[PDB]
Structure 1
Amino acid sequence: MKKYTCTVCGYIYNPEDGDPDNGVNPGTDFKDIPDDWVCPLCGVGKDQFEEVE
């Protein structure tokens, strides 16, 4: 699992940590995050994120 960054605000989704406050548990791959989840920082959707390669 890769980290992904919100290209609008620079928030990094790290799959080891998930986003548990918003119901994304540690170990969720980004592609498995429900498609209505938004960046916890700026609130934009998933389509503004890019795999950190």
Structure 2
Amino acid sequence: MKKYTCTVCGYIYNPEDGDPDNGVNPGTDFKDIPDDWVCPLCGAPKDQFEEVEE
């Protein structure tokens, strides 16, 4: 699965790690994250992330 990075702060969403603290289980693909999720570190919306990977 692709990693994604927050373009506001550089946080990396890693799908193996997820963001469980905010309801995104480890193992969740970025496209499957609910679209009201925000970056755990700076609060930016999901739509300010972009792929690292492909």
Instruction: Name the TM-score, length of structure 2 as normaliser.
Output: 0.95
Structure 1 moving runs of 4+ over 4 Å: none
Q: Distance in 1 between matches of 2:37 and 2:5?
A: 14
* Gapped regions of structure 2 (runs ≥ 5): none
**In 2, Cα distance between the equivalents of 1:35 and 1:47?**
8
Q: Determine the C-alpha separation between the residues in 2 that align with 1:9 and 1:43.
A: 9
**RMSD across aligned C-alpha pairs, in angstroms?**
0.6
Normalising by structure 1, report the TM-score: 0.96
1:14-50 deviation per Cα after TM superposition (whole angstroms, max 9, x unaligned): 0000000001001100000000000001101011100
Distance in 2, matches of 1:11 and 1:36, equals 17
Mapped pair 1:23 → 2:12: no
Tell me, which stretches of 5 or more residues in structure 1 are unaligned?
Answer: none
